[PDB]
Design a protein around this ligand. Sequence first.
Ligand SMILES: [Mg+2]
Ligand SMILES: [Mg+2]
Lengths: 404, 404, 404, 404
Amino acid sequence: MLQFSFVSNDVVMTYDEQIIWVWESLNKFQTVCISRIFNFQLQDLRNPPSTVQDFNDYEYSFNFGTLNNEYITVPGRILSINRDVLIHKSIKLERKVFASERNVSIFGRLSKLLDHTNPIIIGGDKPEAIPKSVFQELQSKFPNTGELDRYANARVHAILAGYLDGMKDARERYEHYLNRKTVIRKTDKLDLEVLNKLEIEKYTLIRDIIQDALNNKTNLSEDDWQSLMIPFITLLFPKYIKVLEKVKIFDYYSNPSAKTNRFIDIALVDANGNLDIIEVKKPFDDKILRKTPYRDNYIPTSELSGGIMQAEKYIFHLSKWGVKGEKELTNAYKNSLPAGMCIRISNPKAIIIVGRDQIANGNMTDGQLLDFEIIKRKYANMIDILTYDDLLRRLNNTIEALKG
Amino acid sequence: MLQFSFVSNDVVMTYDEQIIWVWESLNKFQTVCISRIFNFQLQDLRNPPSTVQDFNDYEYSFNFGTLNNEYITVPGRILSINRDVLIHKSIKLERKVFASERNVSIFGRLSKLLDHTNPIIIGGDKPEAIPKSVFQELQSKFPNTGELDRYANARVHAILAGYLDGMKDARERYEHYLNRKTVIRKTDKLDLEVLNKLEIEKYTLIRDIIQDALNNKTNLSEDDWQSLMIPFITLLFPKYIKVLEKVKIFDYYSNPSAKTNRFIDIALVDANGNLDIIEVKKPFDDKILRKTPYRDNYIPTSELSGGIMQAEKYIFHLSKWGVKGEKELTNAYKNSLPAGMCIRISNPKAIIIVGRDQIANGNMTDGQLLDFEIIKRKYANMIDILTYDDLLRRLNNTIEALKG
Amino acid sequence: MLQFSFVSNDVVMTYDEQIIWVWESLNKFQTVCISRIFNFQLQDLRNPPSTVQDFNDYEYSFNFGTLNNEYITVPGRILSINRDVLIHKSIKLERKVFASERNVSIFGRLSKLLDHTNPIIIGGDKPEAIPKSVFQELQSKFPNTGELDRYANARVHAILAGYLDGMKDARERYEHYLNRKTVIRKTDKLDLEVLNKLEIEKYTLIRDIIQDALNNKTNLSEDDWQSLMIPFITLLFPKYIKVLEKVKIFDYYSNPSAKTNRFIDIALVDANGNLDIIEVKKPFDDKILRKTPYRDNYIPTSELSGGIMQAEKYIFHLSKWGVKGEKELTNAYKNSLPAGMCIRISNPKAIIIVGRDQIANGNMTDGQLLDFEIIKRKYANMIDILTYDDLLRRLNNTIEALKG
Amino acid sequence: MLQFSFVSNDVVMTYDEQIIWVWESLNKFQTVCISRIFNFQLQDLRNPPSTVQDFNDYEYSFNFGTLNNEYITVPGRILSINRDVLIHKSIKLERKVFASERNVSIFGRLSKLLDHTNPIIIGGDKPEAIPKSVFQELQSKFPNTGELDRYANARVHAILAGYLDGMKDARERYEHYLNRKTVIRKTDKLDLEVLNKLEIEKYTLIRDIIQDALNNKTNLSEDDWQSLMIPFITLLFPKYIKVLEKVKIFDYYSNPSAKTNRFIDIALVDANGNLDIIEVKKPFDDKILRKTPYRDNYIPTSELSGGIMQAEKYIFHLSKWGVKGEKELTNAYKNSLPAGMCIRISNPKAIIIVGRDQIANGNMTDGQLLDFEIIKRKYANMIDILTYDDLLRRLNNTIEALKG
Ligand SMILES: [Mg+2]
Ligand SMILES: [Mg+2]
């Protein structure tokens, strides 16, 4: 048992059954550990017990550092910490303040975290002091009996969750109790404003170049347009880490007698190594939609349909190539790919950039807008269908979100 | 010093100071507790030690249960467990099997978890039996008094660190990124090569902070962990321009008479304005794959299945909400969203980052690796299934591609 | 321009320069086509023309029909039909009642359709007389100049619809005008009731045999269970025409150095040769769900997860095998398949029949029911997930629909 | 008789009951019409017939067109149409090119279809140009007095057949099936072999009736065609227990201010209750792919695209309707559905039977056949895409598999 009392200048704690070990260890090392949190020298003991007196019969009295300036001063050596600690009179000195549950040295953990050598002060009129109410809040937050039991139940539950059925939901209860506690402070966060500003600077530059190319560049060929957009594709689509050109694939459907080589003009490699196809096509007023609806339904134009068919054919040829194709593609592009990465077909999908939307023009009526959205999601293989005006709108939305 | 042997298909535990007290306690309470894990009735004791017999030369013998059908059947009363305890014959009986570290009853914690009274079975082909390898993992990863103290030391340190400096390590990494960004961007004008170098610095910064969070911020609450990754989610997934928290959806399936409001902890909005869901789960469980394959095929862990189920339930409610949901969400988040963008619930999908694959260890076999890849792609509404280790590898692949 | 008048109680047709040609044709052959709908002869001429008389001055006079009992009787030869035609006095006599637009013989078409040789009767009190109201309705149904123009516009529209892209969508106009006029009679539709009763008999026989196996034949092993279900699998799922057993599949992912053979126990071939996998598993109470929900979400049981994974592995191996797999499978099963059918892997999907819902014997909570439905529609490859109780419910629904 | 020659890059047509009268008609009307297809003004005549010249000795020469830019430009006045007609130089000018059988101008009908004043262009690489092969298909299929008369005769025959014994041919096929069913099932005890034989008879009956409808009664209204196939829809797709006609759905996207009612012509409800959509399109063309490939890729025809678009729009409205849709649909069709079964919109899918592939002809090339299959599987939200010939082939495959 530990009883804490203050007499005049010094504050003395009393250890209250076999205390023979304490005396022996105190003699052996000139230091004993009381409750794993107190380190006292033979000098610290107010009176050494006589070898003739029974150590168990003797009541041990260990002395803390002298209190002054209305603050109890406790030596660093007793807590085995470099910085000494100051405790206010208003807090009643006790073991709960010194140690948390499981004999955790609250002051010791605090000392390791604090790089400054300035002595810790609690509930003091001094500016560098812990608010007493907040210090009590930290004590409540520290793990307590039954919080450890919830963690223990959760750890065993996680190991046998599949193996054992009928086990109580220990993990859910432990997480819920932990969720009520909020270790992090919302005010102390990372602004990340400079990083966001650089992202805006990157998005604006890509948006400005593509917009300028639509406005003034029509002379350049479709292949020249592909080359212009090839650097931007990696930044517009960060999921695809590498861009591959003229990817030869093998055909076993167009000609049964002999394989026919097919060349994907632009292909995309995911960080996972999955393979996707991107089709870049010359922008036109209406290369994405027709002029007259069929049977009261707007339909995709020959240009868009042909572009979807080209990408669909390449995906179909890759799906047939399967594992053999991945090995051939991996060996051909191993240097291009980051080391430890292999191309995997993984059900290839296609990204299409055809024409410019008339929504910006305002020519498209609400019924046309509905059909335009449906044409965009009509094909599963074409995960995303985009128009150059739509791509600019997506860039504008991303820039606005970063700005806000 | 306990020795376990089987006589006539009946298990016998033999124990070998003064053991006279053990006989006195057995008579006084009709029971004795030995090692703090085993309780034996006076009837249970195999041989009564007579007073004339020398206790020093006598070794206590107690029935430890009966070996039936190749299964050792320790009585529940011995471990003070309401349900029976069964061990396989191949698993050698030891004090370590029943007690971990400082006399911690391993079976006791498992019994508290099991609401059902069905007997615990360890080893063998029994359907409810726990595999010997999993039981060995449970012994090693059991929350022993030392492990509980380690958790308490970590939790106390985390609470003090969060109050003292918040995300100090993340801020230091951000300051390093800012210095690198200034060196790379000597000129205000931006080039594609300059943008790629800035992207490498941004990706390294995000990856370094995530690794630091995994190493020291794991003990944080699930709500606190989501807050740490919420700014990074927009950067890790640029497609999703905005991140929304505590989104409210309507559930009519659970109670037809009255709708029940459900809350999505994190939701992602893309530039198109389509709504998707993201789940960031604290990696409490070390493995995202079950230790033993159910039938030569590795199966998803309960933690992975739970995260998938919770997201699927959210996606199901969003699809059911339909147009009414899009209008309600758009009005609620109109200020948050960039102007001219409306929340549309079309084809809602989910991205889940849960647990750690630890392919770095190399424990996974070629078949196990194949099963893990199939599980990542097995779920229809989870476009990306990720683990914290997998996310770090994807970040590394992006950095290498930008470098080359 | 033909005029019909009654002289001597008989109809007279007057024909209004081709008049000289008609006289020359009358000399060459007795039969002369007037308006392409009427055949007339020298005997029919009331007043035959002569060369000396001016043809232009002369007015043709013919005997059209003889009126008997106040009913006009028209000979078969004039309309070139075997049976005579009767016209009621009240019904006007003109070219339009005799012929539709484009000189289409209404009576000639009707005579071919009528198997009976009884003379066609229009109006009058005769038992088989066609009512005047009905005859006028038939005339309105017959195509007019506007419908012929609309059909002509529709025919040209379809040929160049993709090319010009500037047409007025005349197809939609023509189809809409056609839709307003329905020439079918609701009574004519086949009862098909006798066939539907036979379908109920087939469904009841399958339902009862599956039911008898569930409740009584639990003795059969899983291989024995699959064998009993294989004949029913085609009937339960008619889309899959053929059942393949022990289908050898080349596997490269499990062991890269050496290919490994995976044997799909039951495989299904679509009429188009598409390949699907069916997994028949022994039924058990529940076995589609875990007893305890994980974090308030019920998760798939280990047995269900293992079954889904095994089917997913077979689908994954087939996709990797790709076109080479299709050729190998076609060669192995060409004899079993109908001639002209080749096994095309395409996108392989799996149908899983595992466990029992447990809903009927013990009511499940609404959350359990929602999770059970979600699990079935969770995995993409598992298009259909069923329980034996679900199969009986599906059979009951089909039987009830056929009854009603 | 008309001869076209190219002198000095100018196209001139020469012709040879008196030509002098034609010259007089030019003085009377300031214009003349020749062959009923060509109208020539006074300026058009290349060389005037001098009185001294024997009108007969001179051959009436008229300037027909100007040859410029490697093209033959024909003035609109010559064809009496507002828009000019351009014929490629490689295409020989013939009366057949500008005139169908019995002087039916081919260009005049096309001019009526085209709302825009842009000139019709035939041959060449221009996108607005119509391919020569398609123009040859137009010439052969162009409506002419014979073709229109043939359509009118067939329509009149169908109207009379609808009036008397509409489904008489179908009744005869059903009677044959009933006689065959009696011969097969004499035991009165269902057997798997007996069921297979009954299934073959049911499949043959459906296949024969569908084949008869293709051959005759095709001219019937699209609504009549849907009603004809509506009983067989459940038999063709047995998973779908019930068929719903004119299913009202709520559309909010088309008009923001108010919802607009949309009717699904035919909707399919399965045993689960998952509502699906089937489109039955009356075949009007023998091509489901464009006659000329877009850049070596065969695009889907307008009819196929329009039917898919209509199904996609219905699926989109159902997904937006969500839970509200499930309630309204279930209440409206609760009596129609088996008791205890409710419509669940879930993910709507569409089945489309449109036009005829004519694969049986063998006209399609291997690349065209590959494009055909890819188009059927390239559309999301579609379970399958079917043609009437493809549906018959599927029925044949089921019959052969049942036989063995
Ligand atoms: Mg979460
Ligand atoms: Mg329709």
